[PDB]
Structure 1
């Protein structure tokens, strides 16, 4: 938790994301900073290929950083304990209107910097839906539910995306976090939750440049 740990008080991250949505190929790069133990981070993202994207950047937001989660109480940190080896996370998000977004991400530590590589694939997003019509306005906060499974840590999420008009477009996903470290080489946390608040700070050139910020805290249910 100090200046000598692999995960220091302040950490930087570099990201490369590539894939497609409804057959449209694209690529993004990002760089950010954060305080892992405070569960806070901010990232600057650029669309280097395929921009301006014909779909809402919002569907990519939750795919650009598990190391930055504040842990209190007695909840072992699955991600921080994984280094130097690191970890991966895989996920499938299903939107109520048919769209599906799947991701395979790799997280590594290279020369004190966190490196992310995400391969994403979005399919079946409705032609007239809020996503393909770019009528989204950011995500509401949410609470992820987690417990060990499949040799790793499983997460379940349900989120609501703000859409033009004041309504919401909902989606849910299941994630499997896998450590590159042996199961017997770290403490596995038990059932717990993680509150998340992912917020967009800036944007320009038809979302070809985006600045995101996220606050995340692992904990037990507020109710005693």
Structure 2
């Protein structure tokens, strides 16, 4: 019977630094992995208040993506051992965030460990000046490659003064044991900040994520 229950909790710890500013975050989350939604509460436990935009940290929990039965749910199937991911975010103004993560299931809940480093953000840019205010919905394009599941997305952070600040995101998600990979598909995601204290040292988020077949192009109908 099911390792991943219809309701699952998680704990997460991140160690990070952005433009030299070190910090740690601890959090706990919960959600319904087969329905595709989840929430999390994070606390900046060291290094607060952060001198940069929370939004670059917000996308740093793929067990909770709803999948139709005909798309292998590779990352759920990886449990209880779990999976790792590695991510590069290349922001439009040259800032770069790298992230590594380990996901496992221990004592009936998910355990997440994250390490993050951001560098090369302009001192007067929207990240270091805290001038973003959330992200738009996105669609992560998922595809098998090099024995892992890759995702590619273009994140759009909303600027306080209107307009967007963007990042090209590439992630590699790899099960700790060989698990059947899906074919290429798409995950529609929306992530909201649902609560924060005045200096964003306590932040709560809600995410909805659902996999579907790729829309495809007209060209493919002639194949």
1:27 aligned to 2:20? no
Q: Distance in 2 between matches of 1:19 and 1:223?
A: 38
Which residue number corresponds to residue 218 of structure 1?
211
Alignment equivalent of 2:33, drawn from 36, 49, 61 = 36
Alignment equivalent of 2:135, drawn from 122, 139, 144 = 139
Q: Distance in 2 between matches of 1:198 and 1:127?
A: 26
Alignment equivalent of 2:104, drawn from 98, 105, 108 = 108
Equivalences for residues 13-162 of structure 1 within 5 A:
13-63=10-60, 65-162=61-158
TM-score, with normalisation over the residues of structure 2? 0.95
Conserved? CA contact 1:73–1:219, under 8 Å: no
Q: Distance in 1 between matches of 2:35 and 2:125?
A: 36
Conserved? CA contact 1:14–1:32, under 8 Å: yes
Q: CA deviation at 1:222?
A: 4.4
Q: Distance in 1 between matches of 2:136 and 2:63?
A: 21
Q: Distance in 1 between matches of 2:170 and 2:30?
A: 26
Give 3-state SS (helix, strand or coil) of 2:56's partner. Answer: helix
TM-score, with normalisation over the residues of structure 1? 0.94
1:3-32 CA-to-partner distances (Å, cap 9, x unmatched) read x40111000000000110001100000101
Q: CA deviation at 1:205?
A: 3.4
- Would you say how many aligned residue pairs link Structure 1 and Structure 2? 217
Q: Distance in 1 between matches of 2:188 and 2:82?
A: 22
Give 3-state SS (helix, strand or coil) of 1:42's partner. Answer: strand
1:175-214 CA-to-partner distances (Å, cap 9, x unmatched) read 10010012xxx32100100001010000003000000000
Q: CA deviation at 1:44?
A: 0.4
CA RMSD of aligned residues (A): 1.1
Conserved? CA contact 1:162–1:169, under 8 Å: yes
Conserved? CA contact 2:14–2:115, under 8 Å: yes
Q: Distance in 2 between matches of 1:222 and 1:102?
A: 30
Q: Distance in 1 between matches of 2:153 and 2:69?
A: 22
Question: Which 5+ residue runs of structure 1 have no aligned equivalent?
Answer: none
